[PDB]
Each structure stands twice: as C-alpha cells, then as structure tokens.
Design a protein around this ligand. Sequence first.
Ligand SMILES: C/C1=C\Cc2ccc(cc2)NC/C(C)=C/CC1
Ligand SMILES: [Mg+2]
Ligand SMILES: [Mg+2]
Length: 535
Amino acid sequence: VRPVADFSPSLWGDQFLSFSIKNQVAEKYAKEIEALKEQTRNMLLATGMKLADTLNLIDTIERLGISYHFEKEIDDILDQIYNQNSNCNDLCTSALQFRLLRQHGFNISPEIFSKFQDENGKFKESLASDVLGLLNLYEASHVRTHADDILEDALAFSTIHLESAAPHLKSPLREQVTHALEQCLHKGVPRVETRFFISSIYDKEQSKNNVLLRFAKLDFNLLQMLHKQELAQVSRWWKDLDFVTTLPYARDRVVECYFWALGVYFEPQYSQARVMLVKTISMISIVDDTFDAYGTVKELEAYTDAIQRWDINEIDRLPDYMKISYKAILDLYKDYEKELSSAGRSHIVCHAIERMKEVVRNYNVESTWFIEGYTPPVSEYLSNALATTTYYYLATTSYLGMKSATEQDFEWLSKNPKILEASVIICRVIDDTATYEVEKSRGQIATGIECCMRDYGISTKEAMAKFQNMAETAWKDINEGLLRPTPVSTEFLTPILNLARIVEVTYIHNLDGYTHPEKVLKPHIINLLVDSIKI
Ligand SMILES: C/C1=C\Cc2ccc(cc2)NC/C(C)=C/CC1
Ligand SMILES: [Mg+2]
Ligand SMILES: [Mg+2]
C-alpha cells in the first residue's frame, strides 16, 4: 500500500468512448462486398490454373486479410495440392507451397527443399540472386517443426541475402522485404500484417488486382467499424467502474487489452467472444498489479484465500480496495453466466474460473518468494511462473464466447496440451527477457533470468540466450501442434497460436509494450482502431 508505481496513464483518454456507426456507409460497404466476395470466389474456383498462380492467389487473399470468407474454398484447393506431390519446383514456388500447406496443417514433407541444397545439406549459394525465392524461403523458415532439420539454415541463408539485396530493389518489393526481415508473416498479428500489406504493399503494386484490393479495403474498414463499436462499449464498461481513480496503483490499459483480444480473433463471428475476453484481460491485469505493485504480503494472503473460496461473503475479510477488485471479479463471472444462459452454455464458465484461481495461487507464491528472497532452480521457477503469464487462463477464456466450443474442447485444454504449453512458455520467456533490468533494480531476486543464472552458473547474457532457445523450441512445438490430424478443430488452436504472436509482436525489440505502449502498441492501435484505410 506504499510502493510508488511509475505507471504511465492511458494514452487514449475518452477518444474511444463514443462510436456511432454510419449505418448507410456500413450498408453500402456490405452490399458491394457481397459482389466482390462472389467475384473473388470465382477467382478461386477458376479451372486450369498453374500451380504457382494458385498459390499466389491464396497467399494474396490471405495477406489481404479476406481469406476468412473462403475457408472451404482455400482448404479444398490446398488439400488437392497436398495430395498431388507437385511438379512446379522453383525455390519461390516450393517454399510458398510448403508454408501455405504447413500453416493449414498439411504435413507436406520438407524433402521438397533437397533439390535446392548441395550434398552437404546447405542451401545452394547460386540461389542468392533469386530474391522472390529468398523471400518465400525466409517466410517458410519460420514454420519449422522439429522434424524439419533440413531447413535449419534456411533462415540464416535467406536473411543474409535479403539484407544484401534489399537496398537496390524496386518498390514496393523493397518495403515488403525490409518489413519481412523485421517481422515475419507467420509470427505477426494477423490484423497488423494485413493492414500493412494492403496499404503499404499491395496498394502500391504495379500488378495489383483491383477487385481484390477494393475488396480488402472495404472489408478491413467495415470490420473496423465493428471493433470500434466493441471497444466503445468496452470503454464504457471500464468507465462505469472507475479503477482509473478507485485503483490508481494499477495500469490503465483497457485499449491495449482490447488490442490483445483483437489479436486473438478479429472475425465478426467472434464479437461476443472478444468482448468477454478483453474484460477478463483487463480484470486480471488489475490483480497482477495488485500483487506486484501495491498490496502487502498480509493482504495478498486474504486475497488468494478469498479467490479460492469464491463467494461474496468473503469480501469483509478483505481490505476496502480489494473488495472492489473482488466484487467486480465475481460480478464479471456472473455476467458471463447470464450472457451464456441464452444458449445454455453457461456451465462452461467454471473452467475459466478454475484457471483464474490457479493464476492467483501462483501470484501469491511469487510474492512469498519475493519477501523471502527465494531464488528457485529454473525447474521450480517454471513450475510456478508458467501460469502467472495468465496464458493458460486467457486461452481458456478465449473459448467462452465461441459458440461452437464444447466440453470436450475444454477437457482437452485443461490437460495442458503441448501447443498451449508452448504458447505459455513463449510468453513467459519473452516477458522475462524484456523485464529483466527494471524488475532487478526494483529489488527482484526471483526473476526468471536470475534463477537461470544462479541455477546453471551462467552470465546474464548466457541466460538470455538459453531463454531464447526455449522460445524457439516452443515455436517448433506450436507449428507441430497445428498438423493434422488435430486433437481439436483448428478453430480452437488458432487462438493459442494468436496468443503467441501477440507476445512476439508486443515485446518486439525486447521492451514491455504493454506497460509502455507508446513506442510499439500505439501505432498498431492507431492503424487498427483509429485510422480507416484510405480508398
Ligand atoms: C505479459 C503478460 C503477463 C503479465 C501481465 C499480466 C496480465 C496482463 C498484463 C501483464 N494482462 C494482459 C496480458 C495477457 C498480457 C500478456 C501477459
Ligand atoms: Mg506482474
Ligand atoms: Mg518478467
């Protein structure tokens, strides 16, 4: 109750509080899109297309962010391509084939890349002057599984040569290439990459397809109207409880939390789900700050205890300010119960609650360790720190609003499947690398990186690197987790992959973009939620 937190306040003020949809623009946009959608569908169903032209078609529709209209169409075509083991075998076309099929769960063999390597298993340097090939190899290299050692040098090979070529390339290729080196496609946030592709690249293409371009622009701008509605409604919900003033020790980041929810899914069909999810993110952010930047060892115990018991009767046992958090929390979940009552999917809230209880227990442990000055071995540290990412919790939460999610889906998730552990590890390891210094100067001894130095007996940098490996292993596990046959439908894997993406995108350049949103998140939020795409 006496630590002075240097949390910058919300960048946004009330600018998101009111949004009145221009129903006439909306209906106009919607009507034209039906037509462009249909034309685009026929583009996909065109018969007798070259392989390379079909893959570029699907890639472009995917990068323009409109692929969610043609899930069946795009699937059938990739299925067909997979089962054909094909005979268009230039580097460009092969790497793109590999990437698209793999991203869709088709376990295409990495043997396709042998024709491009010497007898030493190294990529032929004679390819260093095929820039489009190098670019697609580069993107493909980020979808490695552990079975794909054949690609172990694709990333360094393509990188060194893209770097060397980039400055002399025409536009917008030069810009595409430069952006890819900064942010690969597979690990970027979908809305972020789509907005960059439409405005910065495709729109400046000499060969651009006008139908697809108009389509992409109207759709993005139309969905954005929805997100703005969601954000506004969520902004009033955040307002009508005023933790801004009530709980001034906490980070005020509901816009940043909505961005997180939007990264997990952007499709209109997940509107209910996004709104539930972002509420949870906001709330848990509060609890996190509570344990970490204000409440006392004594108060936290009462808090954890109450959370585990989960009944209002316990409020009185908590100091006045924790009564606020605590009731809001309990209400939020009764709200969820109401929203889901309509469809009789109300029972499923308990899975999310159980995961929240878990997070809090581990927050309390993390606190005990801080007081005692305990520096666990990495094993023990991880056994506790993984859940305090909140990622088991958010992933579970992300299913609430999803109308098709069943009990078997939650029963899979509850077992900590490998794809979820990987996403959780990526978040943990990235947050620890980014926040090493600030937490260490603030009297932290239980820091993940400290445990790693003290445990293995290695420098701050040697520990930084081991953590990077864990994240890289983790991505290979995510990539392997998407391959068919999948343990649950792909729709329930994507949010977990997306959770991994958001942490990569937000901690880019190794900085806590959530706590300090100005450098990185702000531009994203502006491009996704403030500015429309100029038609
Ligand atoms: C970096 C994250 C963990 C630390 C923390 C906890 C909870 C919040 C913020 C910070 N909420 C939003 C999330 C899930 C951000 C990524 C997780
Ligand atoms: Mg924290
Ligand atoms: Mg950390």
